[PDB]
C-alpha cells in the first residue's frame, strides 16, 4: 500500500514539471525507502533516475511495495492545480487501479481529491550504476541552465573541457562561436553558489544541447548541479533535493 | 441625452473586460437611474445582466433615455488606454450615432478624447445559495477545466462539491462551512459547461465575493455585487 | 583596431534591442570619436542614426578606423545573454573577419567569449517638443489601436495627437509644464511656426522602443521635412530616428 503526505506540494510539482516533457509515462516504484523512478526518453538517449526519500515526507507508510504506471501529461494537469504550500497526499491501494492525490489548503477549508487511472508499463525499467568518474564539477544550476540556453542559440552541440584550473563550455555554428569559462571560486555568504572542480584526468566531451535543455529544467529542484564526467561513459547531471532525495540524468557523449 | 462622469475609470475598465469575451456587442440602456446591459451569448445559453447605478458616478445626467449599441472589442481598445485613477466621462447625444469617452489624468496635463461609432443592435426564488471568494471559484473553474468540459455542482447543508471527470483523471473540490457559506431549502445537483463558467469567472475583478444561486432546473445565478452600487449577473442553464 | 570596454552591458543591450526590429543588419563604424551606426529601414522611410561616444566607455582604443558589418539578430542572441551589470568588451582586429564580445560577470570567475563573423554591408526646425519618452510611447501604442497614422499638431500652448479609424477616433492633448521635482519629467514646446504633420504609426511603434535609452524624448518637426525623434543617452551619445511625414 501507499500513504505519503508532503508538508508542501512544491517538491512534487517541480518534479513532474522537470521530467514531464522528455518522459511521457513511467513507473513510480514505492517501498519503505521512498518513491523511485527509472525511465528513458523517447529517443532512448536520456536516462532519468529519481528518488524521493522517506525523509522528504512528513508522513510516509508503504508497508508493501507498489508500482504505479502514470501518464505524466495527465498527472501534470492534476498536480499543477496545487498551491506550493498545499498539503499533498499520495494514496494507492495494494494491486492498485489508480493513484489518488489529495490537496489540503493550509488556511482554508478547501480539500481537493483527484484520481488518475494507472497504465501498465508491462516492462519494469531497471537501473543501477554507482560509478567512478574522471572529473566532478559543482556549480549553480541557474548558471548552467543559462549557459545551455544561451549556447543553444549558436549550435546543437556543447563541448565540455575540464582541467584542474577551469571548466570550458563552447558552442560553434555558422553565425559564430561562443565559449563560457568558469574557474573554481567560493561564495562566502552562500556556499551553494560556489564552483568546485575535482579531477583525476582532464576531460573533453561533447553533448547534444537538445538533451541538455531538458536536463536543466530540473534547476528548480536544487541551487546546485553536480556534473560527473568520464571519458567514454554517460555523464551524470545530479540535482540533490535538500529535503532528501535526488533527480539525476545520464547522457552519453557524442562519439 | 447622457453625461456620466466617473471619479475613476477602474470600474468601467473592469466591466468591459469581464464581458467582452462572452458578448461581442451589446446595448447600453441609459436612464434616470443609471446604465443597463442585457445580452445573450451567440449560443443562447448565457444571459449577461449589468447595472451601473447612478450612485457609481460622481456626476450623472440622463434627461431622456438613450440606447448605445457598442462593439465591445472596439470599446475595449479605447477604455484599456485609461489609467485606473483617471477621470472618465461618457457622453452621448439624443439619437446618437457615436459615444464619446473623455479621460483626464489626475497628476498630469493630459486629456484624451475618444469617439466610437455606434451600431444598431436588437434588444426569483432558489433552492440553495452559496457565497465564496470569487478568486477561489475562478481558480477551481480553471483547474477543473483541464479535466473535463463539465462541472458538476452538489450542495448540501454541510458542503459544496465540484466534480469534473475525463480521460486524464477525475477531480473533486469540496468546500465546507466548518471559506464558504451555504443556505438551502433543497439539496442541489446540477452540471454546467465549463466553457461558459470560464467566461463568467472573469468578473472576479469586480468583487471579492461571488454569490451563486441554484435551483432544480432553473438557470443558476452568478452574482458579482459592485460596492459602488450596481452589479454584474450571469444566468446559465444547467444540462439535461 | 577596436577595444572598447563598458562598465556595464546594459547600454549595448538596450541599444541592440531598440533597433534590431527596424534594422536587420548594419555597419558599426568605429573611430576615436566612438561607435556610430547609420541605417535605413527596408521601406526606405526611417533613418536610424546611433552614436556611442567614447565617453560611454570606461576604456576605449580605436587607433585605426574599422567598419563592422553585423547581422543584428545574430548579435542580439549574443548580447541579450549578458547581465546588465556585466563587464562588456567589444574587440575587432585590423581588417577584421569577425567581432568579439567578452562578458565578465561581477563577483564570479565567469568569462564568456563570443565571436560573430562579419558581412559586407553598404537641419532647421519649426517646432521642438520635449516630453517623457514613457508618455510618448504610451500614446503611440494606445492610438495605434485605432488607425495607422498619427496626426501631430503643435502650438505655443499645446501638443495634440489624433488618430482616426473606421471604429472610431481618439485625440491626446498635452500642455507645457515644468516639473519642479524632476525637470526631466517636464513637457516643453518651443516653436517659430505652428506645425501640422501626419506620420505612420507602424514606424512610430518601432521608434518608441528606444524609450529604454532615455527618460526624455526630443521631437523636432518641420513642414514637409523628416521629423527627428532623439533619445540622448546620459552616459554620452544618442539614438536618433528620422521619419518623413505623409
State which residue of chain C sits closest to B103, comparing Cα positions. C172
A110: nearest CA partner in chain B = B175
Contact assignment for A154 to C108 by CB distance below 8 Å: no
Strand segments (E) across chain B: 2-6, 25-31, 34-40, 46-53, 59-61, 66-71, 87-92, 98-104, 110-117, 128-133, 150-155, 160-164, 170-175, 181-184, 188-193, 209-215, 218-225, 231-236
Measured CA to CA, the distance from residue B25 to residue B46 in angstroms comes to 14
| Interface residues on A facing B, Cβ-Cβ cutoff 8 A | 71, 73-75, 77-78, 80-81, 108-117
Q: Please say whether the beta carbons of A65 and A112 come within 8 A.
A: no
Question: Among C204, C222, C193, which Cα is nearest to C150's?
Answer: C204
Q: Are strands B231-236 and B181-184 parallel, antiparallel or unpaired?
A: unpaired
Residues of A with CB below 8 A from B143's CB? Answer: 80-81, 112
Rounded-to-integer distance, Cα A195 and Cα C85, Å: 20
Contact A176 C74 (CB under 8 A): yes
Q: Report the alpha-carbon angle A87-A90-A94, nearest 5.
A: 155
Quick one: closest CA in A to C82, which residue? A150
Are C115 and A177 a contacting pair at CB < 8 A? yes
- Mark yes or no for CB contact A111/B178 under 8 Å: no
Identify the H or E element spanning B20.
none
Tell if the CB–CB gap between B112 and C167 is shorter than 8 Å: no
- Return the residue of A nearest to B139 by Cα: A81
Residues from chain C that touch A182, judged by Cβ atoms under 8 A, are 108-110
Domain chopping of chain B, boundaries: 1-240
Q: In the sheet where B110-117 sits, what is the strand order?
A: B59-61, B2-6, B87-92, B98-104, B110-117, C168-174, C158-164, C149-155, C195-200
- Closest-approach residue (CA) in chain A for B166: A116
Residue with C-alpha cell 519494469?
A: A124
Our CA-based measurement puts residue C229 at a distance from the nearest CA of chain B, in whole angstroms, of 21
Cell of B167: 480521460
Q: Quick check: C167 and B111 CB within 8 A? A: no
Cα dihedral sign, A73-A75-A78-A84? negative
Q: Determine the Cα–Cα distance for residues A215 and A222; give it in Å rounded to an integer.
A: 13
CB half-sphere exposure, C92, CA atoms < 13 A: 25
- Return the SS3 of A186: coil
CB contact at 8 A, A215 and A249: yes
Question: How far does the CA of residue A150 sit from the closest CA of chain C (Å)?
Answer: 6
Nearest-CA distance A112 → chain B (Å):
4
Method: X-ray
Integer Cα distance of C101 and C79 in angstroms: 8
Q: At A185, which helix (H) or strand (E)?
A: none
The alpha carbon of A59 is separated from its chain's Cα centroid by a whole number of angstroms, namely 23
| Contact status, residue C193 vs residue C127, Cβ threshold 8 Å | yes
Please report the number of interchain residue pairs, chain A to chain B, with beta-carbon separation below 8 angstroms: 54
Find the residue in C nearest to A183 (Cα): C109
Q: Which helix (H) or strand (E) holds C172?
A: strand C168-174
Q: What is the resolution of this structure in A?
A: 2.7
B169 and A114 in contact by Cβ < 8 A?
yes
- Residue pair A158/A216 in contact (Cβ under 8 Å)? The answer is no
Q: Choosing among A13, A25, A78, A99, which should be mutated to test the B contact, i.e. which has the most B CBs within 10 A? A: A78
8 Å CB contact of A110 and B136: yes
Query: What residues in A contact B135, CB-CB < 8 Å?
Result: none
Nearest to A35 by CA among A249, A250, A245: A245
Nearest CB to C109; choose among A146, A176, A182? A182
Secondary structure, 3-state, C8-69: CCHHHHHHHHHHCCCCCEEEEEECCCEEEEEEECCCCCEEEEEEEEHHHCCEEECCCCEEEE
Which of C77, C107, C109 is nearest residue A153 as measured by Cβ atoms?
Answer: C77
Total length of chain B? 240
Q: Which of C133, C136, C134 is nearest to C161 (CA)?
A: C136
A11 CB-near residues (< 8 Å, 6+ apart): A52, A56, A221, A241, A243
Using a CB-CB cut-off of 8 Å, the residues of chain B touching A110 are 136, 173-175, 179
Taking the C-alpha atoms of residue A151 and residue C77, their distance in angstroms, rounded to an integer, is 9
Q: Which chains touch B (3 or more CB pairs under 8 A)?
A: A, C
C-alpha cell at B157: 447543508
Q: Which of B74, B112, B115 sits opposite C172 (nearest CB)?
A: B112
For residue C175, give the chain B residue with the closest CA: B109
Which chains border A (3 or more CB–CB pairs < 8 Å)?
Answer: B, C
Gaps in chain C (C to N over 2.5 angstroms) fall after 122
Say how far apart CA A119 and CA C46 lie, in whole Å.
Answer: 60
Cβ atoms within 10 Å of A94's Cβ, excluding its own = 10
User: Do A176 and C114 lie within an 8 Å CB cutoff?
Assistant: yes
Q: Which of B28, B24, B25, B23 is nearest to B12 (CA)?
A: B28
Which residues of chain A neighbour B147 with C-beta distances below 8 Å? 77-78
DSSP state of B42: T
Question: Does the beta-carbon distance from A114 to B174 stay under 8 Å?
Answer: no
Q: Which residues of A8-47 are buried (b: 16+ CB within 10 A; e: fewer)?
A: bbbbbbbbbbbbbebbeebbbbbeeebbbbbbbbeeeebb
Contacts of A73 in chain B (CB under 8 A): 168
Q: Taking CB atoms and an 8 Å limit, are B78 and C168 in contact across chains?
A: yes
CA-to-CA distance for A197 and A137, rounded, in angstroms?
5
For C187, which DSSP code? B
Mutate to test the interface with B, among A81, A85, A108 (most CBs of B within 10 A): A81
Q: Shortest Cα distance from B175 to chain C (angstroms)?
A: 43
Report d(CA A217, CA A202) in Å as an integer: 27
> What are the distances in angstroms from CA A71 to CA A75, A249, B142?
6, 20, 21
User: Cβ–Cβ contacts within 10 Å for residue C180, how many?
Assistant: 8
Instruction: Give ∠ CA B45-B46-B52 in degrees, rounded to 5.
Output: 160
Amino acid at each position: 500500500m501507499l500513504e505519503g503526505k508532503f508538508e508542501e506540494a512544491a517538491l512534487l510539482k517541480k518534479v513532474v514539471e522537470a521530467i514531464k516533457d522528455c518522459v511521457k509515462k513511467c513507473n513510480f516504484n514505492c517501498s519503505e525507502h521512498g518513491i523511485t523512478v527509472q525511465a528513458v526518453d523517447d529517443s532512448r538517449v536520456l536516462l532519468v533516475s529519481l528518488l524521493i526519500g522517506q525523509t522528504s515526507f512528513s508522513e510516509y507508510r508503504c508497508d508493501r511495495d507498489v508500482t504505479l504506471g502514470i501518464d505524466l501529461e495527465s498527472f501534470s494537469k492534476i498536480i499543477k492545480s496545487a498551491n506550493n504550500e498545499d498539503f499533498l497526499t499520495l494514496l494507492a491501494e495494494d494491486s492498485p487501479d489508480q493513484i489518488m492525490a489529495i490537496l489540503e489548503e493550509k488556511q482554508k477549508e478547501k480539500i481537493s481529491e483527484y484520481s488518475l487511472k494507472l497504465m501498465d508499463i508491462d516492462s519494469e525499467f531497471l537501473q543501477i550504476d554507482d560509478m567512478e568518474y574522471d572529473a566532478v564539477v559543482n556549480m549553480p544550476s541557474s548558471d548552467f541552465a543559462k549557459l545551455v540556453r544561451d549556447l543553444k542559440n549558436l549550435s546543437e552541440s556543447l563541448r565540455v573541457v575540464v582541467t584542474k584550473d577551469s571548466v570550458k563550455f563552447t558552442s560553434e555554428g555558422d553565425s559564430g562561436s561562443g565559449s563560457v569559462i568558469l574557474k573554481p571560486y567560493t561564495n562566502l555568504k552562500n556556499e551553494r553558489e560556489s564552483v568546485t572542480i575535482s579531477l583525476d584526468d582532464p576531460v573533453d566531451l561533447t553533448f547534444g544541447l537538445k538533451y541538455l535543455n531538458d536536463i536543466v529544467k530540473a534547476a528548480t529542484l536544487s541551487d546546485v548541479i553536480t556534473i560527473k564526467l568520464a571519458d567514454k561513459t554517460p555523464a551524470l547531471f545530479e540535482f540533490k533535493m535538500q529535503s532528501g532525495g535526488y533527480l539525476r540524468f545520464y547522457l552519453a557523449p557524442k562519439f
